[PDB]
Design a protein around this nucleic acid. Sequence first.
RNA 1: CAUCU
Length: 90
Amino acid sequence: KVIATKVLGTVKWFNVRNGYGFINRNDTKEDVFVHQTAIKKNNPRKYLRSVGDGETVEFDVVEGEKGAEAANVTGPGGVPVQGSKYAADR
RNA sequence: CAUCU
Ligand SMILES: [Zn+2]
């Protein structure tokens, strides 16, 4: 269930271990929760699913289990996300 | 899967 569509955001921080983090909406300057499984287009050259700090993503703000969460996170245009510094190359 | 370092 969608609150906002194809909104652009700047990833605030993402702990690759915990499997979640926050995306700051360029849209509204609000922080939005993001979980590893919401990453629709992951970097094919990284083992794990992650986003990197300072990275610009395109996502949907959906209603989640405990309030709003990000969904179908991709890069701008739908390109694969870049992924975290701490996720390893294949 | 809720503000981690
Ligand atoms: Zn969720």
